Amino acid sequence: SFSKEESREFMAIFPDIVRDLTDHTDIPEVTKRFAKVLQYNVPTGKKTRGLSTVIAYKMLEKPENLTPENVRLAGILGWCVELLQASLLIMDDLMDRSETRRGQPCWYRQENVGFLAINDCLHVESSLYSVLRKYFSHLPCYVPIIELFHDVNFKTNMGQSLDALCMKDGRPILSQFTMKRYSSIVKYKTSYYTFQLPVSLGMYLADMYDPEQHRQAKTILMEIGEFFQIQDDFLDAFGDSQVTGKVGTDIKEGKCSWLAVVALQRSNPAQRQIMEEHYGRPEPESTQIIKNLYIELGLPATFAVYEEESFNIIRTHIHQISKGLPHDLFFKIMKKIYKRDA
Amino acid sequence: GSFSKEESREFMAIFPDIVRDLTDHTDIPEVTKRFAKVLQYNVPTGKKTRGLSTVIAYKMLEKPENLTPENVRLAGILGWCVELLQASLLIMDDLMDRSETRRGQPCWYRQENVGFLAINDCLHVESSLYSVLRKYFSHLPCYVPIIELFHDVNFKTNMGQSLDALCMKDGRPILSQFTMKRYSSIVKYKTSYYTFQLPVSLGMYLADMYDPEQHRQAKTILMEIGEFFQIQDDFLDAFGDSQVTGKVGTDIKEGKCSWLAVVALQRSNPAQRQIMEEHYGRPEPESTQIIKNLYIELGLPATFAVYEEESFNIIRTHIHQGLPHDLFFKIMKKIYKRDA
Ligand SMILES: C=C(C)CCOP(=O)(O)OP(=O)(O)O
Ligand SMILES: C=C(C)CCOP(=O)(O)OP(=O)(O)O
Ligand SMILES: C=C(C)CCOP(=O)(O)OP(=O)(O)O
Ligand SMILES: C=C(C)CCOP(=O)(O)OP(=O)(O)O
Ligand SMILES: [Mn+2]
Ligand SMILES: [Mn+2]
Ligand SMILES: [Mn+2]
Ligand SMILES: [Mn+2]
Ligand SMILES: [Mn+2]
Ligand SMILES: [Mn+2]
């Protein structure tokens, strides 16, 4: 349901994650510093992935099996996803040369961090397998959960690589900016870790190992992932940095974003040359010239129309879900993200 | 095993399968073909001591009658999982230490159209070893312990790296904290766990040796060999031939808490100590050459050569004291007097 009481239930676990990873008695300098890394980077987001892990479980598990112990375990799995999100955001902000994350200067920009952000990134990722070891190592779901986290990370790395290959020799490859390429990027970059991981982690905690059941969840959770990333791409250019918590860099970094794809689809020959000349430039005047074209092409209105159609199209596909999977779970995910401004 | 040609041929024959197993996700050939390039350029170009050690350890810890071609090749695949971890750590390290060359070629992040994308490749190469472990070990009792060992050693290595990186604050090195105590802590976490304990511990788990005391006996002697090994690397950074070592040292420029910088301060007169304060951890080429000229004036090359001989003999005395001694003698014989 994504309610005040669940947000308070979830934030109550976080102190214990910090204690489990920091409280290696011969290097207190580093354990104390890693508490700061966790405190800064892990808990200040919307925590949708982590809260979806708990909601997924509660709606897949048999009502009679929903003990306070079993709910807490779903809470700890959640925070393991947020640990992965944290690691990915530390790296992403370095690679995309971002200014602000979640309302604060990006970790790598801070006084004595810089490239040390690369090590923190890797440290925050490996720390979740330590949390998994302490709480799940005596449960049937231990190996499958470990393997899902390894597979999802590998797939997320490939997403991030395909995302980075938008530029060669300082200029974007606008000829290759297709909706086919776009769909491949968000599938691997976003959908696997953001949407599949929480729901699958819910299924494994409930002992739901049926391959066809996971396959039915995957198909709709990929559609939701695409829908989600298109929202992120819109906000990067037209969002309020005060509300979103970040300054957009998609245009400056010359990303194959949903905006850039649709811009090219609808551009006249003079508008295409603008894109050629000014897309993916370090100059502020170029970024504004591109945003001005985006405005000119009615991409705000175009996004808003798509969002509403896509919401309805996805809902129709959720009503057709089979293999005894709960519909409401997927309606509840869509309700939480539909028309978001952060 | 004895680090022989045939053992390098046996170990290099598995590598094509590792690249096949990770790259041959059919809807994105652009990324899988690029990752085959990332692997080819970053994994097998080292000496491969860690990976070859993992095979040698197993051969010497497993019962002679249980050494099948199947079991030896599994120890090899474990060897490559160690070389994948190494490959990922080196990509990250070169970005952080602002290094020019690695293994005779430009550092990965300096290559045309890499840059900060080297941060993704770093992460991507580490996660790829857990895909290899899954395929070949998921049915064995040693699966979970081997998964966990890697996770633990990675976490430990990350903490090593951080301590190493806190040598500087506000552009100046913290020379008053450059002790042998701090140094022994850096190398323990940064080098010894993944370079020496990991191969041997993997060879034990594949031989179904789960006795904690046996892992604790091996650990004690392998921690000594790691400290020895890192001191050798610290000497080469400043006095090594870059054409031979394959890398241009940056320890003086980055103001690292290296053995050389620790011993320099221990023996420095008050004029020599101010030279360090003024010129250590400076980007300017003239500052790096002044420090190397001070290092030569404190007879540090002769100091290292004496230490290397002493420690080599002291460790051999510790090895003599049901684990196979020749394993630890053969590792020490490989790295003793090395110039790369
Ligand atoms: C996949 C993307 C777009 C990264 C950010 O995800 P969120 O927008 O959910 O970020 P937080 O709330 O966790 O900061
Ligand atoms: C792997 C991640 C973080 C998802 C997409 O990255 P983006 O770069 O598009 O994410 P934001 O910085 O816009 O949150
Ligand atoms: C921990 C250190 C000093 C990294 C280099 O190790 P090696 O000198 O074994 O590197 P390669 O053989 O793999 O190049
Ligand atoms: C690679 C790791 C984690 C060890 C760090 O040692 P260095 O930073 O000195 O590595 P080299 O360049 O000397 O190989
Ligand atoms: Mn970004
Ligand atoms: Mn990005
Ligand atoms: Mn974005
Ligand atoms: Mn280093
Ligand atoms: Mn280095
Ligand atoms: Mn070195």
Numbering used by the authors:
A (entry chain A): 85 to 107, 111 to 429
B (entry chain C): 84 to 107, 111 to 407, 411 to 429
Sentences from the paper on this structure:
Here we characterize a metal-dependent, bifunctional isoprenyl diphosphate synthase from the leaf beetle Phaedon cochleariae by structural and functional analyses. Inter- and intramolecular cooperative effects in the homodimer strongly depend on the provided metal ions and regulate the biosynthetic flux of terpene precursors to either biological defence or physiological development.
Thus, in the absence of IPPHAl, the staggered configuration of PPAl selects for Mn2+A and Mn2+C. Once IPP coordinates the HAl site, the high affinity of Mn2+ replaces Mg2+B and stabilizes the eclipsed orientation of PPAl, driving PPi release. In addition, with either IPPHAl or DMAPPHAl, HMIs abolish Mg2+D coordination at PPAl and enhance GPP formation.
